[PDB]
Every structure is written in structure tokens, then in C-alpha cells.
Amino acid sequence: PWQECMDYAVTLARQAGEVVCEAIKNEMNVMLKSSPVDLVTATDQKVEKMLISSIKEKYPSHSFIGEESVAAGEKSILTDNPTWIIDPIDGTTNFVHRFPFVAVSIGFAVNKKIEFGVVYSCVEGKMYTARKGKGAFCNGQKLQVSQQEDITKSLLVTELGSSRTPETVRMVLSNMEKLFCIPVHGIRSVGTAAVNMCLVATGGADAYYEMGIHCWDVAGAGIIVTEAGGVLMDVTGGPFDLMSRRVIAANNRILAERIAKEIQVIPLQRDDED
Amino acid sequence: DPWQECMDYAVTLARQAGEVVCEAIKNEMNVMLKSSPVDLVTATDQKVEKMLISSIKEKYPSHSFIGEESVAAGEKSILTDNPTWIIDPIDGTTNFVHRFPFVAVSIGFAVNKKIEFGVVYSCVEGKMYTARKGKGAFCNGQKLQVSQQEDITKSLLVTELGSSRTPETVRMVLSNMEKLFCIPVHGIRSVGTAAVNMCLVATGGADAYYEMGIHCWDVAGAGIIVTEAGGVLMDVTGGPFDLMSRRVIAANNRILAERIAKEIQVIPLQRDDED
Ligand SMILES: [Mn+2]
Ligand SMILES: [Mn+2]
Ligand SMILES: [Mn+2]
Ligand SMILES: [Mn+2]
Ligand SMILES: [Mn+2]
Ligand SMILES: [Mn+2]
The missing domain is CATH 3.30.540.10 (Fructose-1,6-Bisphosphatase, subunit A, domain 1)
Structure with a gap:
């Protein structure tokens, strides 16, 4: 092959x-x-x-x-x-x-x-x-990804992003606040999108989300999540798009959709556009 | 030693x-x-x-x-x-x-x-x-050995969000994170344990740790590991570290620690030596 x-x-x-x-x-x-x-x-x-x-x-x-x-x-x-x-x-x-x-x-x-x-x-x-x-x-x-379908028992991973624009940082932290207070069990950040996603693939975290990543951040780890039994989608709830700068990588569609519901989207330049 | x-x-x-x-x-x-x-x-x-x-x-x-x-x-x-x-x-x-x-x-x-x-x-x-x-x-x-970094805008912080889900409290935690983040610092990390976060500062892999809401048993072990690696412990007020106060800054040095203390708004908490 x-x-x-x-x-x-x-x-x-x-x-x-x-x-x-x-x-x-x-x-x-x-x-x-x-x-x-x-x-x-x-x-x-x-x-x-x-x-x-x-x-x-x-x-x-x-x-x-x-x-x-x-x-x-x-x-x-x-x-x-x-x-x-x-x-x-x-x-x-x-x-x-x-x-x-x-x-x-x-x-x-x-x-x-x-x-x-x-x-x-x-x-x-x-x-x-x-x-x-x-x-x-x-x-x-x-x-194998975890089996957890209850968002209130989930452990999430994310990153704060590379922007320091106050408006953007406020939205990132506001999204975190909304998820945190559902509540979820916790949120972690190890500082790399690829490794965060691999941790979801292992089942050690239940889902990852981030806005502002690029195709090269997620192209390797996405298929690792899905071959572990996970799912990828956009934070909009739409289909995952390598070039869209946005990702939810989760154990399953139930957590993924619950996360998307909470996330206010930030405008971002696509990787495939000028 | 005995x-x-x-x-x-x-x-x-x-x-x-x-x-x-x-x-x-x-x-x-x-x-x-x-x-x-x-x-x-x-x-x-x-x-x-x-x-x-x-x-x-x-x-x-x-x-x-x-x-x-x-x-x-x-x-x-x-x-x-x-x-x-x-x-x-x-x-x-x-x-x-x-x-x-x-x-x-x-x-x-x-x-x-x-x-x-x-x-x-x-x-x-x-x-x-x-x-x-x-x-x-x-x-x-x-x-x-802790890191040498004295420029807060080139530092990497570790912290945790805490066990409270009280909206007012969470807002303060996130507000403190926002202020530090927008100094700016290079980044903030969270591996999910105060002790390990502090041990990462001891190694020099992170420049400073801060948290309000921990307990004496969270930090009793790792505190001296940071200071013996050349770092400092401090209250979030910039004052002396108080093991029973629920608050800590554990940093590579006093310059970063005091800079962090400056941005932090204190969250009210019951001390470990209070009922
Ligand atoms: Mn880069
Ligand atoms: Mn890179
Ligand atoms: Mn990258
Ligand atoms: Mn406990
Ligand atoms: Mn414990
Ligand atoms: Mn503990």
C-alpha cells in the first residue's frame, strides 16, 4: 500500500x-x-x-x-x-x-x-x-479512545493560542469558562496540538479543541485519533477541514457535539487562502 | 543528619x-x-x-x-x-x-x-x-537547576484552574490568567498536578508556577525541591510563602515571582489551619 x-x-x-x-x-x-x-x-x-x-x-x-x-x-x-x-x-x-x-x-x-x-x-x-x-x-x-459520553465527567485538552489580541484572548478564555462550568472534570494543556491529540487517541483525555491551529498541526494526529476510534469535526459542528484552522478531536460524536455547542467561533484566515 | x-x-x-x-x-x-x-x-x-x-x-x-x-x-x-x-x-x-x-x-x-x-x-x-x-x-x-529567565515576556508559566466551579471564582481564576497571558508571557501550561507543575519549575522546563486553592499537602514536597534547585517560594501578595494559606508562587527567581504577584488578584479561601 x-x-x-x-x-x-x-x-x-x-x-x-x-x-x-x-x-x-x-x-x-x-x-x-x-x-x-x-x-x-x-x-x-x-x-x-x-x-x-x-x-x-x-x-x-x-x-x-x-x-x-x-x-x-x-x-x-x-x-x-x-x-x-x-x-x-x-x-x-x-x-x-x-x-x-x-x-x-x-x-x-x-x-x-x-x-x-x-x-x-x-x-x-x-x-x-x-x-x-x-x-x-x-x-x-x-x-483506543475513552468510552466517556458524559461531558460532566470529561477531561479536555486545549491551548490558549498564539494571539495576544485582548478581544481574541477574551473569547478563548470565555470559551474555556463555558466548558469548565458545565462542569467538566478538568482542562489540560501540554503545549503541543499534536501531542494533545495523541493523548485523546490514548484515552488519557476525552477530547481536544482549538481554534487557530494550522493543517500541519493536525494532519499527523487526526488520523491517529480516528484510528483509535475517535472523531474529528469543526468547532462549528461541521465536517473536519484540514485547512479551516479549527478542530475538535474527541473520543466520540456525543462529546464532540456538546463541545461545539459551547464554542464561540473566532474569525480566522484559512490555510488555503490569501 | 538525623x-x-x-x-x-x-x-x-x-x-x-x-x-x-x-x-x-x-x-x-x-x-x-x-x-x-x-x-x-x-x-x-x-x-x-x-x-x-x-x-x-x-x-x-x-x-x-x-x-x-x-x-x-x-x-x-x-x-x-x-x-x-x-x-x-x-x-x-x-x-x-x-x-x-x-x-x-x-x-x-x-x-x-x-x-x-x-x-x-x-x-x-x-x-x-x-x-x-x-x-x-x-x-x-x-x-x-531552575532556569535563568528574568524577562517575564520570555517566560513559560504553569498553573491549574482549580476545583471550584463557582462562576465568580472561575472568572477570577481566568481573569488572572488573562492578565499574565497578555503581559505577554510565552505561554501557560497545565499538566494537572501542583506537585508535578512545581517539579517542572525545579527542572527549568517551566519558569514559574502559581495557584490559589491548593493545600499544604500539594506543595509541601515540591516546594523545597524548587528552592533547592535555586528557585523561590512566595505568597501571591509578594510576601513570604505561607504553607497553610492555600496560595503559592514557586518561581525560578524573585524577579519573575514578584512580577506575577503584581498581576494576580487574590481569591478568598479558607486556610488549612481554619475551620
Ligand atoms: Mn511555529
Ligand atoms: Mn512547528
Ligand atoms: Mn505546530
Ligand atoms: Mn483530592
Ligand atoms: Mn491527592
Ligand atoms: Mn493534591
Whole structure:
């Protein structure tokens, strides 16, 4: 199948993780992108170029969407062509702080649909993988989402986002308040969308939601959630859309829809538009 | 030290408790309620505490105890000058119930109302955090050191949302988070346990922790781990840390700690030494 590509992606993710693990122990030269909290290092850029060059060598006809390449001006247009969607370091803020949740994420799409995903949580050495119809795994353990259908007994994960616009922050915190006071059992944040979603795939959390993420944040981990038996959808309640900047990844449609009901949507530029 | 024997024993008990927790987290559970539908307890919380207290009692029968589930059973949380074991059998019960992979056993040891050593065992991770006053802080044998960051706008904070769901209180918690977030700081994280949050500050992986609503047993173990890693403990008023006050800032340094105190509005709470 696409098994050969996927096996290759796993090896590449592991080599990239090694690079990240070595770098996290050394001095940080922190650079800014769009804001004082939108960070990047040479390691983000070096890993992405290593991944893309390696994939290009083995699969010259394939396409790429990568976070830092987009920063370099490349487009985030998803065609039917086999496409590697890469976040070279998901959790750069974690990375520069040595907060031990840092992931390399690779999603592989054919006909605009994800066929496999790989998320390597580098510091804890957890390799999360899933291939469509083949199940989801972490380090040899098959994953299953939780069974919880009662929102008042749920544990959620989310992130506060990269915006510091007071209006936007107020909405993010207001959405959190509404969910919190349903009540739910709690809300957690480990600082990486990919790893948050993998935690839902393991059943250790019941659902994740976030507005403001990008296709590369969720392309790897989405299929890991669904192959664990979970569901993806938009915070609008509509179908999940890789390019829409919005995601609920949950154990089931009952929690997912209950969460969507509470979330006030924020306007966001799609990844596939100017 | 004469307390060194106590500490060695504490490390032994913590690992033992940790093994019990790690086994139970894979199994089905009876989840019970304490003060509210979101304030949870399991048979494991209670069993681990009973085991820890009885073990310590047999070996040091003149010592005092402050334990979370014992207080729930009616025992007094008053700290005297007597050697006192301050115990959270499972810090992270909601995590435990969900198999969210951050769960800690915490033991703090006070003499003359001052913590002499702390032990925090992060069960799922297999990370034993320890510190004896004057002797430094360690994680699995490796010496810990807090971060150097003095610029709040380049800091990473940890905190928790708390057990209250009272709208007014939640609004204050979130308002405090908003003020810090918009300074700005680089980010805020929550792994679901005060003890582990503080141990992350000890390692330098986070720059500071703050919370109002914790109890002495949440922070008794990890507090000295932070300070022996080079950090500071402080009240949210910027004043001296008060173990029984329900409030804490645990930071890499006083510059960040005072900056955080500046933004925080205090939430009214019953002290651990009040009825
Ligand atoms: Mn980035
Ligand atoms: Mn990234
Ligand atoms: Mn990312
Ligand atoms: Mn409790
Ligand atoms: Mn507890
Ligand atoms: Mn606790």
C-alpha cells in the first residue's frame, strides 16, 4: 500500500527527533516570526529542510506543505497529489523552554485525504502512528479512545493560542469558562496540538479543541485519533477541514457535539487562502 | 543528619506507593465524590495514604501527620513544631481517574513548621524528585537547576484552574490568567498536578508556577525541591510563602515571582489551619 512511505516517514520522524533531542540540551537562539510570542529556531528550519530533502530524494513526484516553508513563502495548497504535511517542531515554545513535550509531525494525504500520520514526541520517546484502516499505535501499544459520553465527567485538552489580541484572548478564555462550568472534570494543556491529540487517541483525555491551529498541526494526529476510534469535526459542528484552522478531536460524536455547542467561533484566515 | 534516615525511608515509601498507583491506573476504578461532582477520590488514594501513615507511624511513633484523605476523614490540618509528615497520596486524582499520564505521590517533612525535605514521585513517568534542605534538588540522581529567565515576556508559566466551579471564582481564576497571558508571557501550561507543575519549575522546563486553592499537602514536597534547585517560594501578595494559606508562587527567581504577584488578584479561601 502506502506502507513503504509510512515506514519511511517513521524512520525520518525518529531521525528528526534525535536532532531535536540533542538541540534541546544546548543554547537557544530564539527568533521571532509574526509576534513576540511566535517563536522559531534554527532547529525548526534545519529539521524541516532535512525532512523535505529526504522525502524528495525517495519520492520526487510528491508534494509538500511545511510550516517553515510556508513562512519562507511557499503555499499551503492541498492537491490530490501525494502530499507530506510537516510540522518539524510542534511545540517550539516548549522546545526553547525545555518543557518536555515536543513533537515532529508528518501527515500524508492522497486525494486530499489523510492516509497515514506519524507524531514523534521526542523528549519522552513516544512514537505515535496510524494508517487508515490499520489502527493507531504508540510504541507497540494499540490505542483506543475513552468510552466517556458524559461531558460532566470529561477531561479536555486545549491551548490558549498564539494571539495576544485582548478581544481574541477574551473569547478563548470565555470559551474555556463555558466548558469548565458545565462542569467538566478538568482542562489540560501540554503545549503541543499534536501531542494533545495523541493523548485523546490514548484515552488519557476525552477530547481536544482549538481554534487557530494550522493543517500541519493536525494532519499527523487526526488520523491517529480516528484510528483509535475517535472523531474529528469543526468547532462549528461541521465536517473536519484540514485547512479551516479549527478542530475538535474527541473520543466520540456525543462529546464532540456538546463541545461545539459551547464554542464561540473566532474569525480566522484559512490555510488555503490569501 | 538525623533527618536523613527519615528522608531515605520516605523515598522508599514513595516508590512503593508509586508502584501501587501505577498498577491501579491500568485497572477499573470506583470513583467517589468528596466536596463536589468534580472533587474526586478513589480507593487507591485512601489505601496509599493509610499505608504511608501506618508505615511512618510504626517507624516514628512520636511524629505527626497531615494527610489529604485523613483530613477528609476529619483529622485536623494544623501544623505544629513537631516533626510532621505532610502527605498527598495521589496528587493528580482527576488525572489518575482518566489515565492522564501525570500522577504524583508527595511527601513533605516539616520540623518547627519548616520543611526539611521533600519527596515527589511522578508515578507514570518514573521520575523521583527529592531535596533535603542545604543538599540540593535531584531528579533520578541528576542535580536540578531552575532556569535563568528574568524577562517575564520570555517566560513559560504553569498553573491549574482549580476545583471550584463557582462562576465568580472561575472568572477570577481566568481573569488572572488573562492578565499574565497578555503581559505577554510565552505561554501557560497545565499538566494537572501542583506537585508535578512545581517539579517542572525545579527542572527549568517551566519558569514559574502559581495557584490559589491548593493545600499544604500539594506543595509541601515540591516546594523545597524548587528552592533547592535555586528557585523561590512566595505568597501571591509578594510576601513570604505561607504553607497553610492555600496560595503559592514557586518561581525560578524573585524577579519573575514578584512580577506575577503584581498581576494576580487574590481569591478568598479558607486556610488549612481554619475551620
Ligand atoms: Mn511555529
Ligand atoms: Mn512547528
Ligand atoms: Mn505546530
Ligand atoms: Mn483530592
Ligand atoms: Mn491527592
Ligand atoms: Mn493534591
